[PDB]
Subunit: 154 residues, 6 copies
């Protein structure tokens, strides 16, 4: 049931100084950070990441948004991590996101793009693809978090 | 899409020392405080604010409640601020409010009135009316919050 | 409307150092701690507490889980405390729990048992029974919390 | 008695950065009572009056520009030895020197031509009295019970 | 070894104000282990025994009234040099003098006839030993692993 | 100018305990800018190079074992007098001595054969320069605006 998912702490979150608060929510949930780095995405990489939206009217604005400033890309590992992180993220448009979710508590204002604090892979398949776009195997680690032993079935 | 809504941090919140925590939730969401002051509402002003409830059985108790101690009235500005703040507030009766919402996390106990931490305008129209009841134009301001520039479409 | 409910801060929460954070959520909601103690539940007591699950496939694992390390048993008092605490706890399986709830924010990983941070009585009847299992009348108290006077109808 | 009132100004840097709530919560958590509060936009005349004791100091101009840059939140805190206590909570004038745990220590660092330091706290009972009068009318200050006030009642 | 056990009492003011959780979290976050804990309502005999060293001091009576005002939460914290560490976390006896960041510094200020100061922390290993015995039976103290205990294992 | 860059390492104890976010938030809240950051697993060669000044010290071996125990998060913080400021935020080397409010003061205590102390902070501008180079390539460090940067613009 253990899966890996890719999360991008977007430019709006970085500029607003919310990196730590976002990371803490994942750590507190029990999710493990197995990879992470601050990078500045270029248009080519951005369009590959968001290839599914190439023919949508907001594509250009979305690429401008994700490449506006550096972002923090990270890989989270844990039981059903993909669906869990999507649940934690909340609705795409922050105004519709429920209080308690990341977008619900931190997002609201938008530009030409629907600024929404973070990106979260939408499926195990997508996560695999996205993780490969931003990380090399040598940047992903296997190590124990403090409470790992507690759940070991002997 | 930018709107203004009126919020009243009720006597129960003031007495319990929750003013700051409530304000922080709005600031963290990205909402801008364009007006704010601690006042002690008298019955006349209270009945004008809650005119819609004049013929309800809980009217008297509600007026007693809102005028019990000083309150903090404030105007919040932001994208769809009215519906967003209502969403953040949660169900009228705190016991029914979802965890994560203001009433959900802070409210529960009631008196003869359903004490519920805060008041939030229910519509743009109501907000306009309520804002006018408590504030003069000279008490409302236009200024930039730190991240405002980020969302400017050039 | 004032009720008492039993909550058990389970071994996973104790080991992870989440006792305080869990307690704070209840205090902030307005709930009153009328009884509380750290104990180490033995199998006999554990099976009495979870008697309803005796014929379920996960029974053995559940008993192992709840008796793994000491836990903190506590009695919470307040308006509709039973349903309110259940609401605050969230879905049984933490991966399904909504962000904002205790299980939603803190739980995810599981062992042979569905580790979910806390236990909360499912009804007033169950609460009565469970409270009696862990506490003697002399361990339960009646005292005023700071804001109690605020809600007194004269 | 030991109960005093002091003036706090949540400065433009704090307002712009969205720290109003976090600052207020620190005072509420300490047990201090907010007896008056409002968001205002200080004009140069009022700013220079508040900081008149620095009228003949080199940093005066930058200070006025800073305090009047955007709206601020002025408030009056009441409580046991509130003046010295709030000053202690504020921390060293230059935030880089302020101890972690203090308001300036946890939230301040960067400066403009002025030493931006998150908040203002009256330095003495005499200054508190003068400052409260500059920003608040008696009609804007209130006497009411905070939840735990009854717990501290002395004598019988 | 360096591992010690100390006694902490979350006093009536903290309980009434709903600060039990916040106080416990500070100890958990520090890495201290809670090996015993319970809510009890201290009677005068036990209160006077705990504070026997102040038996002949003017504030004694007010102190007993205060500590027995409502139920409290007594707990035993275990960890490296726990006695001095918890004392440091507590801060100065009179909360108005306690540094921001400490428990008394962030949460205490107001007083009654007694100097209400949020919590009690054993002042020495000798006092800790005596105090733990007054409130806890060995059967109420436990040895178990906290999540990160394995990380600190020494030697091979 | 007064703007400096310093190197911070969120050590294995912090990573294992899930404190990465809380530590980063303290720097963000202070107003410091993260210009570089990544999770890496330090090897003995790099660890010994970073701590070369302790090459001939008794605790060296335990120190290397500790810093290479699990992955860490290295990051570069930029801001006014960042070196001394971050050091101040970190607190005393041995967490038991660190003041409440500091990172080590609030989060550290227990030790292994090494004095586990949550994070590493460059001790000087010279050390910061050397350390940043050991862990980061210029291509991994960025210049960008944080939300409030405009507020502090000096002069006209
Ligand atoms: N301007 C604009 N941007 C959008 C819209 N929908 C989505 N976006 C942006 O494009 C991103 C990706 O879209 P999508 O995958 O559908 O949403 P997500 O998976 O929840 O992030 C969203 O997170 C927004 O940043 C839209 O309708 N208009
Ligand atoms: N006693 C009592 N008070 C109520 C009841 N419904 C609402 N109230 C109080 O009256 C306030 C205004 O009512 P309403 O506008 O319907 O709810 P709101 O807009 O969510 O605050 C509520 O916030 C409560 O303070 C009720 O059924 N009984
Ligand atoms: N292994 C396993 N454990 C379960 C399952 N369902 C429940 N549990 C565990 O048994 C406890 C009690 O079950 P139940 O009363 O139905 O859920 P609760 O009232 O929400 O705690 C749950 O909290 C879990 O700890 C399950 O389907 N499989
Ligand atoms: Cl949502
Ligand atoms: Cl963990
Ligand atoms: Cl709701
Ligand atoms: Cl902002
Ligand atoms: Cl749920
Ligand atoms: Cl209360
Ligand atoms: Cl200081
Ligand atoms: Cl209070
Ligand atoms: Cl101190
Ligand atoms: Cl731990
Ligand atoms: Cl220190
Ligand atoms: Cl910023
Ligand atoms: Mg998507
Ligand atoms: Mg209404
Ligand atoms: Mg059940």
């Amino acid at each position: 049931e253990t899966e890996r998912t890719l999360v991008i702490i977007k430019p709006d979150a970085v500029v607003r100084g919310l990196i730590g608060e976002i990371i803490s929510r994942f750590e507190k949930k029990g999710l493990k950070i197995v990879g992470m780095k601050m990078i500045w995405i270029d248009r080519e990489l951005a369009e590959k990441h968001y290839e599914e939206h190439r023919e949508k009217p907001f594509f250009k604005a979305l690429i401008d948004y994700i490449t506006k400033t550096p972002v923090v890309v990270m890989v989270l590992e844990g039981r059903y991590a993909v669906e869990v992180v999507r649940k934690m993220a909340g609705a795409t448009d922050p105004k519709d996101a429920a209080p308690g979710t990341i977008r619900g508590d931190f997002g609201l204002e938008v530009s030409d793009a629907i600024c929404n604090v973070i990106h979260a892979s939408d499926s195990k398949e997508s996560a695999e693809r996205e993780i490969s776009l931003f990380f090399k195997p040598e940047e992903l680690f296997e190590y124990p978090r403090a409470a790992d032993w507690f759940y070991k079935k002997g």
